Amino acid sequence: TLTARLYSLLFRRTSTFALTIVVGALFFERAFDQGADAIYEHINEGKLWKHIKHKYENK
Amino acid sequence: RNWVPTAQLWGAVGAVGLVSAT
Amino acid sequence: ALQVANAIIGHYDCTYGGGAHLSSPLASIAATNKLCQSFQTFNICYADTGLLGAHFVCDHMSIDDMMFVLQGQWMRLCTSATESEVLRGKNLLRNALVSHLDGTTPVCEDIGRSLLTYGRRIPLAEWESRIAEVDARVVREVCSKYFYDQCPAVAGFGPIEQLPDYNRIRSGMFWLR
Amino acid sequence: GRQFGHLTRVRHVITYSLSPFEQRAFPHYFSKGIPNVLRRTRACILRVAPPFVAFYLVYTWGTQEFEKSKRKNP
Amino acid sequence: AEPEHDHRKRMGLKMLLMMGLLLPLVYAMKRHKWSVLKSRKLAYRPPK
Amino acid sequence: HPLMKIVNNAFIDLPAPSNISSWWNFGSLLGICLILQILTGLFLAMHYTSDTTTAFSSVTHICRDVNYGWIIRYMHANGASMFFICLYMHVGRGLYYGSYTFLETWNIGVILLLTVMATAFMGYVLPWGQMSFWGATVITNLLSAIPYIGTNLVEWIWGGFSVDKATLTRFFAFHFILPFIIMAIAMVHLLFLHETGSNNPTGISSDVDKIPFHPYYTIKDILGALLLILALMLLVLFAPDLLGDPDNYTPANPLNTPPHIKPEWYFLFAYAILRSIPNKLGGVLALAFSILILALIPLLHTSKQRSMMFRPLSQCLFWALVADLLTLTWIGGQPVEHPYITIGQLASVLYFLLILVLMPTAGTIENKLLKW
Amino acid sequence: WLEGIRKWYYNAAGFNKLGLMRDDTIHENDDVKEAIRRLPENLYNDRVFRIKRALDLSMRQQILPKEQWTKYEEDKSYLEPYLKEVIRERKEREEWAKK
Amino acid sequence: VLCRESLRGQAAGRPLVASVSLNVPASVRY
Ligand code: HEM
Ligand code: HEM
Ligand SMILES: CC1=C(c2ccc(Oc3ccccc3)cc2)C(=O)C2CCCCC2=N1
After folding, report:
1. Residue numbers after which chain A breaks, C to N beyond 2.5 angstroms
2. What is the DSSP letter of C45?
3. Least enclosed by CB within 10 Å: which of C44, D46, F60, F229?
4. Which residues in chain E touch residue D16, judged by CB atoms under 8 angstroms apart?
5. Residue F201 dihedral angles phi and psi, to the nearest 5°
6. Which residues constitute the domain of residue F163?
7. Ranges of each domain in chain D
8. How far is CA C160 from the centre of its chain?
9. Which residues in chain B touch residue A13, judged by CB atoms under 8 angstroms apart?
10. Dist CA F81 CA F231 (whole Å)
């Protein structure tokens, strides 16, 4: 099945359970931050510094 | 004998985790 | 391999001689500390299923401990199994087969049962082939298959206030590890 | 008692349980629950609410009467 | 008065999102564990 | 293993009752609050300075310049309130379910409350804003009402003839240590509780139906911890200045009193009971007795039923006492003018009347209805 | 005369919805504990289950079906006659200790 | 034990013989 295939090979052992969590958390951090940053930046469009930075900077 | 793949996997968990946190 | 497995954990009664020096750690621990009156590992078999586990009789303050040693032995055998104790496990079963088929009534039972269950009578040489087949890796692969991280059927009768909660028993069916 | 085994004398009871993996986590949650929640609300409301209503009445009145006394008169 | 104002609200979003994720997941674990007791059935059988 | 065995009998296989509602979750949260206040507080004290010249600058230095200093401050400042919310839940639970029948546990409790009140009061002085200074100047001076030695007691407390640099620096010392005395007391609070076991909502001996703390109440207290964290971080990230007073962002000035002078929200009920009585000493004794009457609650108990679960009259009067406290909390927030003086007067008498007169009588009637 | 309110209060109390009799909800102390210890096997093992079931109900935040509720007329005072004697013996011991 | 059916065979079949062992449970044959 779908979920059993995860259990069988990925997290039956507690040894690999942790390796999954660690690596999953490593990816989740990149994924979530990036997403929620972009959501907040789209919510607040044009008002933050990064949006009006090109404005006052010829370098 | 049997704790070699476990201790290696926990060795990876510790290694990647210490790399994660810093 | 499951008969070999149950032979390693073995069985104990308070009338046994060996006591503290017994081979199976559960019996040794249970004899020294005097945890239980008796315990017996069973494999009840049916057509396409069965009951693989154990039975014990003990004082009302010894249930958690007995359970902890028993599950500890299952988990141990699943994850780590010495070649020596598996050879002992084989030899116990080797002796069990030849001890049981002595006299006509057990052999007549064996025939009558074998033909209904197995389909044919299995010779002792074939059994020995399957026992000699079993080594440490086979016991671990098989024990871990049937016992590691599996919900067990539990039955308690008597002064069982100490009998651990099912979640705690279920937590004991896998390891830390 | 304190320890499991020395708590108390229980006799002739049988407890049937089921593994959490065998059974469901949220069995009939919105089905049976929302009625049960409502029933519990009906049980307590009469004892719980009227003091907070009485607070709200004294609150708004007291603030109203404070604003009346604050402003000018003739 | 409040230079943290922007950063703080971003943490706010991320907190609400993450709490939105976790609260049901934790509640599910609580329900999964307590299930054993919540489904249980008590049968009294005295002798005569 | 003589530590693990303590932790086993404490938190692993302690037999808890089976039927404990979410009102028992506040005990563990109060510890989480205490640990949160300690950890946040420590990191604030790493940058904070207790001199009247620098005290304000240091707090603002934390918020502005110390990396993530603001989030640590408002976690301390709002966590202080969350600690108090949790306390008032934790105290009320025991009032309702009759948990005060564990006398020593309860009386250690009553101490734990008073120590936190002192901790949080002295904590509020530290940043050295107007309301912090003037809060201390008002609240401390109350002791001068004591008949023969109060005027001396106050000057000794302050370290001079007013609230000043002498007072601020010692208030920091007292603030940063008393939390550890609280944690020490709290372990004795728990120590008597294991002797007596834990109570359940029915008020009926649950020895017949116990369950192991782990894994049941571990995962339940974890769930509750996230709800406390949620409630904290909602305050910290969206409304950090909500519960706090604006005047404390004006630096302290002893030559200029702010008009609407008051304590923080968690003392306003007691402040309202003090303002109710016109005589100064009477106001102080009523203020004191408002808290300390908690110690008489187990003596005022009458009903043959322990818990209020099966007691309508008591339930209504209990929920009246909550509303009456919320009335006093409101009145304490408002200035001492009409009509709030008369509302405060009635509310204050009602408070002591519910506790001393009515709720005992309710229990006695409730017995007579059931042939007890 | 006013047995009604005695009946109203009984129903308003709500322990009958859990299938408890009045004396199941009595607050334990030295006298009650002693009275409960004096109870014969049947009444003890019954109150055990009545309480064990009522707690199980209280866990799930539910009550029994309406017919299974305890009746004000059929609410037996099983514990009283024992508890009266325990109290009277304690009063006697105190009155003797007085002299 | 309780009825007549199970109670059959209990009567002494032969003089008792006590067996103790290292492995096998201690029995009293006949
Ligand atoms: C720092 C403050 C406090 C901490 C950390 C604390 C901690 C605890 C904990 C962990 C429990 C067990 C879990 C629970 O039932 O909530 C408990 C129970 C209790 N506490 Fe507290 N407590 C505090 C303050 C108080 C106060 C102020 C009172 C009363 C004036 C009090 C009275 C009780 C009572 C009566 C119980 C038993 C509850 C029951 O079983 O019904 N505590 N406390
Ligand atoms: C029960 C525990 C505690 C409570 C209830 C508490 C409460 C408070 C309160 C209400 C303030 C004023 C917050 C503000 O509006 O600025 C404060 C400030 C402070 N507290 Fe605590 N506190 C506790 C523990 C601690 C501990 C343990 C320390 C150090 C170890 C500490 C260090 C400080 C410092 C340095 C300040 C000044 C900075 C500031 O105002 O934020 N506190 N505390
Ligand atoms: C002992 C105990 C604790 C408890 C849990 C954690 C404690 O210590 C802490 C651990 C971590 C953080 C804060 C406190 C102290 C008591 C509870 O909550 C409960 C909740 C209701 C069941 C009885 C009970 N018993």
Report:
1. none
2. E
3. C44
4. 40-41, 43
5. -60, -25
6. 1-372
7. 1-74
8. 22
9. 6, 9
10. 11
Q: How many CB atoms lie within 10 A of CB E44?
A: 15
CATH number at residue E37: 1.20.5.100
The CATH number of the domain holding residue F207 is 1.20.810.10
Q: Is F247 a catalytic residue?
A: no
Q: How far is G49 from D10, CA to CA, in rounded Å?
A: 8
Domain count, chain F: 1
Instruction: Indicate the residue of D10, D11, D40 with minimum beta-carbon distance to G61.
Output: D40
Enumerate neighbours of D (3 or more CB pairs within 8 A).
C, E, F, G
Domain residue extents for chain G? 1-99
Number of domains in chain A: 1
CB distance F328 to F347 below 8 Å: yes
* CA nearest to E37, candidates C42, C85, F25, F217: F217
Q: Distance of CA F343 to CAs A16, F123, F252, Å?
A: 65, 31, 32
The verdict on the CB of residue F198 being under 6 Å from ligand 1 is: yes
Q: What residues have CB less than 8 Å from F357, skipping those under 6 apart?
A: none
Cα F285 to the center of its chain, rounded Å: 19
Annotated catalytic, F194? Answer: yes
Q: Which residues of F303-341 are buried (b: 16+ CB within 10 A; e: fewer)?
A: bbbbbbbbbbbbbbbbbbbbbbbbbbbbbbbbeeeebbb
Domain G1-99 has what CATH class? mainly alpha
Across the interface, of C151, C161, C166, the residue whose CB is closest to D4 is C161
3-state secondary structure D5-47: CCCCCCCCEEEECCCCCCCCCCCCHHHHHHHHHHHHHHHHHHH
DSSP one-letter string for chain E: --TTHHHHHHHHHHHHHHHHHHHHHHHHHHHHHHHHHHT-EEEE----
3-state secondary structure of G23: helix
Peptide bond into C177 cis (omega under 30): yes
| Other residues' Cβ atoms within 10 Å of the Cβ of residue F287 | 22
Supply φ then ψ for residue G70, to 5 degrees: -70, 140
Percent helix, strand, coil in chain B, to 5, is 85, 0, 15
DSSP states of H1-30: --SHHHHTT-S-SSS-EEE--SSSPPEEE-
Q: Do B2 and C80 touch (CB under 8 A)?
A: yes
Task: Return the C-alpha torsion angle C109, C112, C117, C123, nearest 10.
Answer: 80
Instruction: Report residue F86 CA to chain centroid gap.
Output: 8
Residue F348 host element (H or E): helix F340-353
The pairs formed by F57-63 with CB atoms below 8 angstroms and a separation of 24 or more are F59/F126, F59/F127, F59/F128, F63/E4
Residue F214 known to be catalytic:
no
Give the residue from chain B lying closest to C78, CA to CA: B2
Task: Tell me how far apart the alpha carbons of residues F36 and F44 are, in angstroms, rounded to a whole number.
Answer: 12
With beta carbons less than 8 A apart as the criterion, state whether F303 and F359 touch: no
CATH architecture of D1-74: Up-down Bundle (1.20)
Domain range for A57 is 1-59
Q: Which CATH number does the domain housing residue C32 bear?
A: 3.30.830.10
Give the domain range for residue C137. Answer: 1-174
- Could you tell me if F314 and F111 are in contact, meaning their C-beta atoms sit under 8 angstroms apart? no
Residue F16 φ then ψ, to 5°: -90, 155
Asked if F33 and F228 count as a contact pair (C-beta separation under 8 A), the reply is: yes
Q: Which amino acid is at F99?
A: S
Q: What is the CATH number of the domain that holds A28?
A: 1.20.5.260
CA distances from F50 to F34, F46, F119, F139, F174 (A): 22, 11, 16, 20, 12
- Identity of residue A26: L
**What technique determined this structure?**
X-ray
- What is the experimental resolution, given in Å to one decimal place? 3.5
Question: F126, F174 in Cβ contact below 8 A?
Answer: no
**Closest-lying ligand 3 atom to the alpha carbon of residue F225:** 12
Q: Which residue of C has its CA nearest to A16?
A: C177
